[PDB]
Design a protein around this ligand. Structure first.
Ligand SMILES: O=P(O)(O)OC[C@H]1O[C@](O)(COP(=O)(O)O)[C@@H](O)[C@@H]1O
Ligand SMILES: O=P(O)(O)OC[C@H]1O[C@](O)(COP(=O)(O)O)[C@@H](O)[C@@H]1O
Ligand SMILES: O=P(O)(O)OC[C@H]1O[C@](O)(COP(=O)(O)O)[C@@H](O)[C@@H]1O
Ligand SMILES: O=C([O-])C(=O)[O-]
Ligand SMILES: O=C([O-])C(=O)[O-]
Ligand SMILES: O=C([O-])C(=O)[O-]
Ligand SMILES: [K+]
Ligand SMILES: [K+]
Ligand SMILES: [K+]
Ligand SMILES: [Mg+2]
Ligand SMILES: [Mg+2]
Ligand SMILES: [Mg+2]
Lengths: 518, 518, 518
C-alpha cells in the first residue's frame, strides 16, 4: 500500500496516526508550492535552471535589499532559465515572480565605517541610540543610530528593542527627546544595517513608504505576478497597496504578510481584503513571544483554508541548511507539519538566497512536502471543509465539490481543469483533493499565479485556438492527458476526472466527466 | 478566554484551529515532562539548581561518553541540587535520573596532530577507511579509522556510509579485507570520535555489549530510575536489558530508543516488552530518509498513546540554542507539534549538555509545552481514546476513566491520586485529562518515575503513617490539596477530583470523589 | 451474544442497524416506565395486583370521566394492591398515581334513551348541532348536543368538526345562532359523551376551569404523585396549575400534555415551566395533520432528553389490543421506536382502562421496551448527550457523568444511587446509561416519582436509620445489592457502580465506587 492509503482508511485520527508507514511510498506529484528567495547563491541562469528542476515554483525577490538594476537582472535570469524549458509545453513548468516589499522596517546605521565591520556588544554594558544622522555611519558598542525618527515617541523605559533577527536585545533605561540609554540583555556580534523590532510599541511608520511606492511601480513595470506586502496591520493597509498598484496592477495578487501583533488581531479584516496570506514567522516571532507563534500559524492556515485563500508558511523552515547539506530533525518536522496544518505553499529565504546548499534545500522541501501530503487525513479534512463551506447555488462550486468527491471515490490520477483566470482550479483546490489538479490555461499569468494553490499543477497550452470550440476543448484536455503521462502522474489505464464548461469564456465550468486516460 | 477554551469548544478540528488565540493565556501547570542531558555546561550543583527551577524533571546521563567515576559525580550533584529543596515537601520537585546506554555505536578515531582541529572532506575526493589500529589516533582527510571490526563484512561496493550526525556521506568504491576506499558525496569538516551509520547494512554488534552490561549494573548500584536503551531492534533486545537489570533492578523502567529501520518495523513487539519509548530522531533520521522521520514519530507517539505507555520525543528540538539564546521558528514549531502529537516528554541533548544556553533551552521548552498543551483538541482526543481503549472488567480502569470524564465536566483544577507504585496515576494520564494529575506517594522512586507520564505532578509525602488508615489517606489528600494551592493550581473555592482505594496496598483504587478545595 | 452488544460496538449508525440480532436476548431489567390508565377493565384490587406483576409502574386516572368518589376508590384500590407486596421490601415495587385533568375539552351529550345506545351516521347526511340543553340527553342521528357554549362564535361555514377520536368528521354548512347545520363527511356509529375537536378554531375555554381546580385540589388531598395537565398551550397555563396545587402540593410533578398546535409552537416555554412532558398524540393527531405527529413526537422527546426532563409517549400505542390478544405490526414498531426516540415512559389508555386484554397489553409494552432498550446506539447517544451537556460546576453532575462513563467502561450490572429527593438518580438517568439505576430512598414519594425517568428502578428502604451514618449508608447500599440479586439484575461476582454523598441531607452526592456485588 502506497501514499499511506492504509492510514487514510482509519476511522479515527488517532488510528490514522498509528498507521503512518515509512515503508509506504508517496505518489509522484507534490502538491505544496515551493517559494524560493533568489540572491547571490541562486541568481545565475545556470543555478536557476537547477532550482526549477529541483522544485521551485515561485521566485521571491526581497526588496528590503538591492537596487532596481540588481532585481531587474535577477528577474531577467529567472525568465531566461524558465524559458530554456519552453520548447516542450508538455514538460514546461511555469515559474512565478514575487516582489516582497521592504515596508515599514527600522534598521541601524554603519559600524566603524566598513559595512563589513562588526562591534561585539558586551552584556550588561550600556548603549546610546542616536537619531542624529551624523552617526548614521558612526556605529560602535557605544552609539547606535536607527532609521525610525519617531522612535522616542512610542518607546518607554523598561521597553525592549531587538536587533538582527531579534538575537541581540536591549532594555530602554533612559528615554530622552532624541536619545535612548539602554543596557544590553544578551548582546553579541553586531553588524551594520540590521533589523530592529519594538515589541508592544505601536510603530507609526507609513503603510506604504516612498521606497515602497518606487518598488511597487517597478513591480508593475517588470510584470511581477504577486506582491508579498510586509507588516500588514489592518485592512486599510492592504487597500493602500491595492490603490497604489491601481489599474495597471489590478491583476497582481496581494499576499499580506502577518508579522506583528496587530496583524494577528485584525487578521479577519486583512484576509478579506487580501488575495492570500503569508505567515512571516521571522518578525512575527520577535514581535510576539516565540512560544506563541505555532498558535498564530495554525490559526491563520485554518482561517485561510476555511476561506479558500492561499496561505504561505515562511521563514527558518530549514535554517541550518544555510551551512549544512542536511536539515535538523526539528526542521524536517516543521516542513511536514506546515503541510499537515494545511499551508498551500512553503518558503525558503536565506537557505536559497545566500546559503551554501540552495539546491539541497529546495529538494528537501520537495521531499518532505510529498511525504506529508500523503499523510494528511483526507477523510476528516474533506468532511470538515464540506460542512464548513458557505452554502451556495453557484454551478461552478457544485461542480468543483462533485469532482473532488468523485476523485476520492475512484482514487483518480488527477483532476483536469480548463480555466482562463484560474478560478475553476482554485475552487477545486479549496476542497483539498488528494489527486493533483492539472490546470490547463492559455493565460501565462494565470499559469504562474496558480502555484499559490495547494495541488494545482499549472500547464500552459500554446496551441492555436481551433475554430470549432468543441475541438479546442478536447485539444486542451488531451494536452493535459499528455502532461500527466509524461510526468508520471498516471498512465493509459487509469481513470481521471475532467472539468470543462458549456460555453467559451470564464465563469461557465459546469461539466464533470470520469474518463480513462487514452 | 483562558487556556484556549474557546477553541476547546469547536465542533470540528478545522474550527478548533481557527480559534487558537495568542491572547488566550495558559494555566500555570505544564504537563509535558522535560528531560535534560547533563554535561559540562550543566554539571555543577549551582546550575543544576537553576535547571530544576527552570523546569527540568529528568536528568539524562549519556553513557556514550565518560567514566563511571565521572557519572557517579554527576549523579551526586543532581541529588545534592535536588535535595537542596527537600526541607519543604509542599514545594519539593522530585527529579529522576536516567541512564542512556552507549549500545552498538560505531565511532571514528582521533584526528592526527590536532585531535579535534577538523580535516576538510570535499565532494568527490577519495577517503580510505581502515581498521588498522596504527591509525586510530592518526585520522585525516586521506585515511579514517573506525570502531567496527566487521564493517567490511556487512558493506558492499555502492554502500553508503554516514559520519557525524549523518552530515558527511561516503560511497564505498572498493572493498578490501581490512579497508574500504570511498568517494566523498556530502563533504564537510571531520572531527574526532564521530558517530557512523551504515543505513541498509545489517550491523552485527550486540544490542547489549560487555560495556553496556557494566554500565547497566552500575546504574543499579547508583539507584537510577530508568534506562534509555540505545538501538533496540526487537523484543529480545529489551528482554536482555531486563535480565541484566535483574532482580535488584526490577523496578527500574526500560525505555527502548527506536533509532533504526528495524526498530520501527518491529515496533509493536518492542513496545509490548518495554515500559516506554523514545523516538531517538538523531540516529533515526540518518538510518531512514530524513523526510520520513515525522511519519515514524507520529506513528510511535500514536501507538504508545493507544497503549498508555510513555513516549519521549528527542533530539535537535532546540538545536540552534546550543549557540544562540533564542530558537529558530522551526524549533519552536517542533516542540509544539511533539506535544500536540501526544508526546509524554520532550528532551534536550546538546542544548543542555554542552551549549551556551542550557537554562534558556529548558525555559523555552517549558513555555512552548504549556502553550501547546492548552491548544490540544481534547474533545476529539478523549473521545477517540475512549472508543479505542480495550473494554475491561478492571475496576481501577473504570474509576480512572470516570475521573477524567468528571474532570472535563466540572473543569476541575486537578485530579488527585494516591498511588504506591504510580499505576493508578498512569491509568488516569493515558486518558489525557486537561487538568493536572497530582500523584501523592510516599515511595520516592515512584515520585521520580512519574515524570515519564504526561500531566502527572508527583509529590512525595514525608508525613509519618497514621495508625488509622482513614486518617492516613485523608492526610495525604490534604497534602495534595496544599501542594495545589501553593503551586497555584487551584484556590480554596475550586473543585477537584480525588482518587483513593478501598484498602491499603497496590491495586485497589476504586473510589472517585468530587471535592471542593479546603 | 447478549443485549445487542455486537451492534453496540458498531462504528456507524448504519452498521449498528445491520447488526441488530433477533437472536441476541436482552437483560432482565426493563428501563422504560409503563403508565397504565385504570378503568372498568383494571380497577379491581385483584386485577391491579396482576397489572403490577405485569409491569405497571404508574396508575393514570382520567378525570374527564368519573366522580371524585369514583376516583378516590380507584386510588384506594391501587394502594391496596401495591401495599399487598410491602411485606418484602426487597421485591416490593413502588407504584405511582397520576391525575390527568379533563381540561378544556368538548364533549357531546347522551344518545336517545339508553346510555349504551348508539346511532348510525351516514356519509353525506346532515346533522344539526344544538347547544340547547333540552337535548343534552336526546342526542341522535338528526340532532347532536355539545357542551361548548361559544362553539358557534369560533367556527365558520365550511369548518371541519371531528367527533369521537377524530373518527367522525363534520363540515359546517350553515352557522346558526345556537346551532350548526353540518354535513357528515365520514360516517360511523355515534355514542354518548364523545370528544369533539375544532382544528384551526381558537377555542376559548379556560386552561384551568372550575372543575379542574376542584380535581387538582382533590389530587393534593389524595396525595397523588404527579398531574398530567391536558391541553397546555403556554407557560402561563402551567403556572396556573402550579398555583392551584400550591404550597401544599409543591412537590407534585406537573407533566404538561402537548396536544394542540399552540402547545407545540410554544413548547420551549412550556417545558421550562414544567417538570415533564407528555406527547398526547390522540388529540395532537386531530389538532394537527396526522402525518406530522411523528415530527412533533421526535422534536419533543429530543428536547426533553436535552433538558433532562421526563417525556411520555402516549396514546394508541397498542390500540388493536383493546379487542385482540396480540398487537398489529405497526403497534409493535411504534412502542419500539418511542423507546429508541428516547421516551422515558410509554403509556396505555383504552388498552388498560376498558380493553379485553389489559394484562396482555402491559406485558407486550414490557417485552418490546426491553428489546428496544438494548437496541439503542449508546455510543452515539452518550457522546451527543455529553457534547450538548451544559457547562456547570455542580459536583453531583460531575459525579453522575463520571459514573455513567465508568458503567460503560466495565459493562457494570447497575449504578446504585442513594437519594433523598431523587435528584441524584435523575442526574444519572439523563446521561442514559445502559445499566439500570437502582435508586435507594427512604422517601416514599421520591420512590414513586422516580418512575418518570428512564432506567431508574426505585427501591424503598424501610430499615430504621442507623446510629452511625457510615453504617446507615452501607446498610442502604447492601439493600440495593440484595434487590439486584433477587430480581436477576446481577450476581455475586459482578462489578457495579455505587454513588453516595459525604454527609446527610440533599445536594451532597459526590462519591463513586466501583465494587463487586457481595
Ligand atoms: O476558470 P474560469 O476562468 O471561469 O474558466 C473556466 C472557463 O473556461 C472554459 O473551459 C472555456 O474555455 P475557453 O474560453 O478558453 O475556450 C469554460 O467553458 C469555462 O467557463
Ligand atoms: O497505584 P497503586 O500502586 O495501585 O496504589 C494505589 C493504592 O494505594 C491506596 O490508596 C493505598 O494506600 P497505602 O496502601 O495506604 O499507600 C489503595 O487504597 C490503592 O490500592
Ligand atoms: O439526591 P439527593 O436528594 O440530593 O440525595 C443524595 C443525598 O443523600 C445522601 O446519600 C445522604 O443520605 P441521607 O441524608 O438520607 O442520610 C447524601 O450523602 C446525598 O447528598
Ligand atoms: O519577512 C519575512 O518573511 C519574515 O519576517 O519572516
Ligand atoms: O540517541 C539519541 O538520543 C538519538 O540518536 O537521537
Ligand atoms: O389526552 C391524551 O392523552 C391524548 O389526547 O392523547
Ligand atoms: K518583513
Ligand atoms: K543512540
Ligand atoms: K383525550
Ligand atoms: Mg522584505
Ligand atoms: Mg547514548
Ligand atoms: Mg383527560
Amino acid at each position: 500500500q502506497t501514499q499511506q492509503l492504509h492510514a487514510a482508511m482509519a476511522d479515527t485520527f488517532l488510528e490514522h496516526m498509528c498507521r503512518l508507514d515509512i515503508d509506504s511510498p508517496p505518489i509522484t506529484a507534490r502538491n505544496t508550492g515551493i517559494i524560493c528567495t533568489i540572491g547571490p547563491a541562486s541568481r545565475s541562469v545556470e543555478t536557476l535552471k537547477e532550482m526549477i528542476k529541483s522544485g521551485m515554483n515561485v521566485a521571491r525577490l526581497n526588496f528590503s535589499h538591492g537596487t532596481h538594476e540588481y532585481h531587474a537582472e535577477t528577474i531577467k535570469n529567472v525568465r531566461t532559465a524558465t524559458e530554456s524549458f519552453a520548447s516542450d509545453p508538455i514538460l514546461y513548468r511555469p515559474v512565478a515572480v514575487a516582489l516582497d516589499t521592504k515596508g515599514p522596517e527600522i534598521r541601524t546605521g554603519l559600524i566603524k565605517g566598513s559595512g563589513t565591520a562588526e562591534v561585539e556588544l558586551k552584556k550588561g554594558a550600556t548603549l546610546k541610540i542616536t537619531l542624529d544622522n551624523a552617526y548614521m555611519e558612526k556605529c560602535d558598542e557605544n552609539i547606535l543610530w536607527l532609521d525610525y525618527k519617531n522612535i522616542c515617541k512610542v518607546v518607554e523605559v523598561g521597553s525592549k528593542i531587538y536587533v538582527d533577527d531579534g538575537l541581540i536585545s536591549l532594555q530602554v533605561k533612559q528615554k530622552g527627546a532624541d536619545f535612548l540609554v539602554t543596557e544590553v540583555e544578551n548582546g553579541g556580534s553586531l553588524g551594520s544595517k540590521k533589523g530592529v523590532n519594538l515589541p508592544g510599541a505601536a510603530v507609526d511608520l507609513p503603510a506604504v513608504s516612498e521606497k515602497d511606492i518606487q518598488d511597487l511601480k517597478f513591480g508593475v513595470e517588470q510584470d511581477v505576478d504577486m506582491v508579498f506586502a510586509s507588516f500588514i496591520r489592518k485592512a486599510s493597509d492592504v487597500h493602500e497597496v491595492r490603490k497604489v498598484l491601481g489599474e495597471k496592477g489590478k491583476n497582481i495578487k496581494i499576499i499580506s504578510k502577518i508579522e506583528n501583533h496587530e496583524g494577528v488581531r485584525r487578521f479577519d479584516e486583512i484576509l478579506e481584503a487580501s488575495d492570500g496570506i503569508m505567515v512571516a514567522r521571522g518578525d512575527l516571532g520577535i514581535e510576539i513571544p516565540a512560544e506563541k507563534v505555532f498558535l498564530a500559524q495554525k490559526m491563520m492556515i485554518g482561517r485561510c483554508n476555511r476561506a479558500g485563500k492561499p496561505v504561505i508558511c515562511a521563514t527558518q523552515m530549514l535554517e541550518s541548511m544555510i551551512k549544512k547539506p542536511r536539515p535538523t530533525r526539528a526542521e524536517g518536522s516543521d516542513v511536514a507539519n506546515a503541510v499537515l496544518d494545511g499551508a498551500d505553499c512553503i518558503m525558503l529565504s536565506g537557505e536559497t538566497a545566500k546559503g551554501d546548499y540552495p539546491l539541497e534545500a529546495v529538494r528537501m522541501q520537495n521531499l518532505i512536502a510529498r511525504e506529508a501530503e500523503a499523510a494528511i487525513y483526507h477523510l476528516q479534512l474533506f468532511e470538515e471543509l464540506r460542512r464548513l463551506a458557505p452554502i451556495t447555488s453557484d454551478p461552478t462550486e457544485a461542480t468543483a465539490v462533485g469532482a473532488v468527491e468523485a476523485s476520492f471515490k475512484c482514487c483518480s490520477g488527477a483532476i483536469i481543469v480548463l480555466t482562463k483566470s484560474g478560478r475553476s482550479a482554485h475552487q477545486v483546490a479549496r476542497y483539498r483533493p488528494r489527486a493533483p489538479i492539472i490546470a490547463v490555461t492559455r493565460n501565462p499569468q494565470t499559469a504562474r499565479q496558480a502555484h499559490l494553490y495547494r495541488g494545482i499543477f499549472p500547464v500552459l497550452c500554446k496551441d492555436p485556438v481551433q475554430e470549432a470550440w468543441a475541438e479546442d476543448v478536447d485539444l486542451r484536455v488531451n494536452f493535459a492527458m499528455n502532461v500527466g503521462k509524461a510526468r508520471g502522474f498516471f498512465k493509459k489505464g487509469d481513470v481521471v476526472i475532467v472539468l470543462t464548461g458549456w460555453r467559451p469564456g470564464s465563469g461557465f465550468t459546469n461539466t464533470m466527466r470520469v474518463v480513462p486516460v487514452p
